[PDB]
Every structure is written in C-alpha cells, then in structure tokens.
Design a binder for this molecule. Structure first.
Ligand SMILES: O=C(O)CNC(=O)C(=O)O
Ligand SMILES: [Mn+2]
Ligand SMILES: [Zn+2]
Ligand SMILES: [Zn+2]
Ligand SMILES: [Zn+2]
Length: 418
DNA sequence: ACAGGCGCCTG
DNA sequence: ACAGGCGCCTGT
C-alpha cells in the first residue's frame, strides 16, 4: 500500500501505524485519553538476529522498565527502514501498567495457583523446550516445574476448526478427574477476566479488537466473555513457564494476544527488588540509540536511571537432559553462556518487565517472543503467572463447527454406497 | 518439501 | 488403562 518489503520486520497495522513517531503519540493519546508522560514510546530496531543462550534458551539484553508511577502506557514502535509512507512507523507492543484492579490481581494469583497446582492438566507445547529438546528451564521436579494450562476453544487440524467438533457439552475449563464445582470456579474467574479485559482491548487496539469480534454472533460457543463484545476464544495460564522463542502460529491473522501478568507477593511494589523475576522478550530487536522525541541524552538518561536496563553477559550452571523429550511417543550440569549474544551489538533481546496486574498487547502470531527462565521455578508458588488471551484461526462456525463436521462425514456415506 | 503442533472422540 | 480415526499450515 506504499511506493517507498522483506527483513524490515513483519508488516501489520492493526495495533497502530503512522507516518512518524509523533503521529503514534497522537493516536495513543487519543486512545488512552491522556497526554504527556502517561504515554511512553520506545523505538525498537528489528535486526533479525535472535538473542539466545549457548543452550538456545531465552535471554534479555535490554529491559524496558516502568519509569515512574506517572507512566501509564508503554508503546514499542518500529520505524520501517526506508519508508516515508503513512505506515512507516507501526506499533508492535502496548503495555498498560495498571491493567486490572490490584485486589483482583492479588485474588486471582492465589486462586489460580491453588486450583491449577492441584487439579490442573498440563498442556505440552513446542515452546516448552529449546530446539534440541533437552533443556530444563521449567525445572526437573514434575510436581513443581513450570507449566502451561490452556482452556477455552482451540483450532484443530483434524477439523480445520474448533477441537470441540465432536464434543457433546465440551468442558472449556477441564480439570483433573470430574469435579464440576471446581471447574465452575475456575471458569467464573477466567470468564470474568475475559469480560473485564475486552473493553481495554477495544480502547487501545480497536482495529485488532474489531477483527476478533467480526464473527461473534456466528460462533458464540467458541468465544469467551459474558457481555457483548467477545474477542477471545481461548486462554492459557503460564505458571513459571519459560516460553522459548516462538510465534503463536494458530492465532487468527490480523489479531493480537493480550497477556495479564500476576506476580509473586515479593514483587508487588514499584520501588522494590524481588528475589526473582520473569521477563517478556522480543529476541529479534535491539533498542534505539535515541528516545521517542529523537534525543540521545534522553535515551542515555533512561539507561542510567534504570528505565532501560542495559544487561551484560552471564555464565550460569544449568541442567541438560541426557535424553530428548519425545514428540508424540537422567540429566547433567552444564555451563550456559550468554557472551556471544552480547558481543554482537545487532543480536536482539529487548524485554519488558510486566508488573502485577498489567496488560500486554502484541501480535504474537507475527512477532517472535519469549519469556525468561526462572532461577527456581515453582508452579505451587510461582514468580509470575501470565494469562494469555487469544483467538485461533477458523473459529467462525457455530456449535464448535459441529454441523460442518457431520456434513463432511455424511459425504463419506455417499462415497461408501458406490 | 516437511517435522511437528495451547487434542478429543469412539471402541 | 488402551488403540485408532479425523489432517492443516508455517518456518525453513
Ligand atoms: O507469558 C508471556 O508473557 C507470553 N506468553 C506466551 O507467549 C505463551 O504462553 O504462548
Ligand atoms: Mn506466545
Ligand atoms: Zn530452555
Ligand atoms: Zn512505505
Ligand atoms: Zn469451540
């Protein structure tokens, strides 16, 4: 749509686009309803060189941290190299520091932990391990190791639609065994949160939100939420889960992912130093040498203030499995280094530090992203809980696509009698 | 090409 | 507890 594209980064506008960074501020000021220092914009440069440890596990090289209590909205923008059009600068990440009420976040942290640690059924995903399938970033204790728990509806290759095509009364929030009371409590928590987060999605990313509500009245059984405007279809809970570098390839194109962060009780004040902390990382990006307004000194001031933490290399002892985890059916200590990624200035690794009750928005299908491993993961008392709300592709059929499935296999009855 | 996935169903 | 069915698409 311009006469100015390959490895400039993925191109999309449904989070926000404009001719320059100043135009982005006008948009974000109009969306959020405030002006000035409440909105913070950081320029990030796409390099395409993935930051990773010597074992291939997520690392951060720069940490964007909330500057002050006056900073309410954080926006990461990408200036597409060599573009002078009206989409030369696009938005790739939005972070509402004060996303949900803190009493709700305090309450959700303990309830989801206690429910999921006891009755939760673990969902094994590809990003749970590094590429050699031998890391131990989640921890090796099966009772305490970090884990992913997915709920709602999901896309299925066997139906090219919702996985509940053959499910009479599907259990969107299934827990171990058959405990309807406990599943109802978990359902109410995540349904209330989907309901609360929906208007925030619409306010700050209206174009992407509008794309996810297009077929709301055609396939309501594949949507979450209890009020009009239901952009989410599935939700995943991540308890001390180290998501290795990945894209969420099942998500619907031109959509986005909303992540609500809940943190351990030792990491709930602004001016505090927690014992451990999980970060959300964009491995293909470096930070700019300049701030939103084009000042080098403002960027250098943020680095010395801590608003942009410039990390250095590390060498830590980690565990590596003696046998890779099998696709579909002991250990030894090893040094994991990071010096190689820090010696190359163009190797990426821009992270944000999500706070208790914050809400993060990003197009997780297009942008490579990851979460750092915890020093001592423990899903019974996790450092970080992330609730990831998304809508998968081909989720626009009523009743989980039941009518299309039995119509497809009714065609087999016609082919059978031949 | 092609390995491998935020699966659930009947029997 | 199990076996076997239903098969799409993306990064590379
Ligand atoms: O937890 C986060 O911040 C990001 N989570 C994911 O990307 C995921 O679970 O797929
Ligand atoms: Mn993800
Ligand atoms: Zn790992
Ligand atoms: Zn252009
Ligand atoms: Zn469904």
């Amino acid at each position: 749509s311009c006469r100015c594209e390959k490895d400039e980064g993925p191109f999309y506008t449904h989070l926000g686009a404009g001719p320059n960074v100043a135009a982005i501020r006008e948009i974000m000021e109009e969306r959020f309803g405030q002006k000035g220092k409440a909105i913070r914009i950081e320029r990030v440069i796409y390099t395409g060189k993935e930051g990773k440890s010597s074992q291939g596990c997520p690392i951060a090289k720069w940490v964007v941290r909330r500057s002050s209590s006056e900073e309410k909205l954080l926006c990461l923008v990408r200036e597409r190299a060599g573009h002078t059009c009206e989409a030369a600068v696009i938005v790739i990440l939005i972070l509402v520091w004060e996303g949900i009420p803190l009493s709700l976040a305090d309450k959700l942290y303990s309830e989801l932990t206690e429910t999921l640690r006891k009755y939760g059924t673990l969902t094994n995903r590809r990003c749970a391990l590094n590429e050699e399938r031998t890391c131990a970033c989640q921890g090796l204790d099966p009772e305490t190791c970090g884990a992913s728990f997915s709920f709602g509806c999901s896309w299925s290759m066997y139906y090219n639609g919702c996985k509940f095509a053959r499910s009479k009364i599907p259990r969107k929030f299934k827990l171990l065994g058959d405990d309807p009371k406990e599943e109802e409590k978990l359902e109410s928590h995540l349904q209330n949160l989907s309901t609360l987060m929906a208007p925030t999605y619409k306010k700050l990313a209206p174009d992407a939100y509008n794309n996810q509500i297009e077929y709301e009245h055609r396939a309501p059984e594949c949507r979450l939420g209890l009020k009009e405007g239901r952009p989410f279809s599935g939700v995943t809970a991540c308890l001390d889960f180290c998501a290795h570098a990945h894209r969420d390839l099942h998500n619907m194109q031109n959509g986005s992912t909303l992540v609500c962060t809940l943190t351990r009780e030792d990491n709930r004040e602004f001016g505090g130093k927690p014992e451990d902390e999980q970060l959300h990382v964009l491995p293909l990006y470096k930070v700019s040498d300049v701030d939103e307004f084009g000042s080098v000194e403002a960027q250098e001031e943020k680095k010395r203030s801590g608003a942009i933490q410039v990390l250095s290399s590390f060498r830590r002892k980690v565990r590596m499995l003696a046998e890779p985890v099998k696709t579909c059916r002991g250990s030894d200590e090893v040094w994991s280094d990071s010096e190689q990624s820090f010696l190359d200035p163009d190797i990426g690794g821009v992270a944000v530090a999500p706070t208790h009750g914050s809400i993060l928005i990003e197009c997780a299908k297009r942008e490579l992203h990851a979460t750092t491993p915890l020093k001592n993961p423990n899903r019974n008392h996790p450092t970080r809980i992330s609730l990831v709300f998304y809508q998968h592709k081909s989720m626009n059929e009523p009743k989980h696509g039941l009518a299309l499935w039995e119509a497809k296999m009714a065609e087999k009855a016609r082919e059978k009698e031949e």
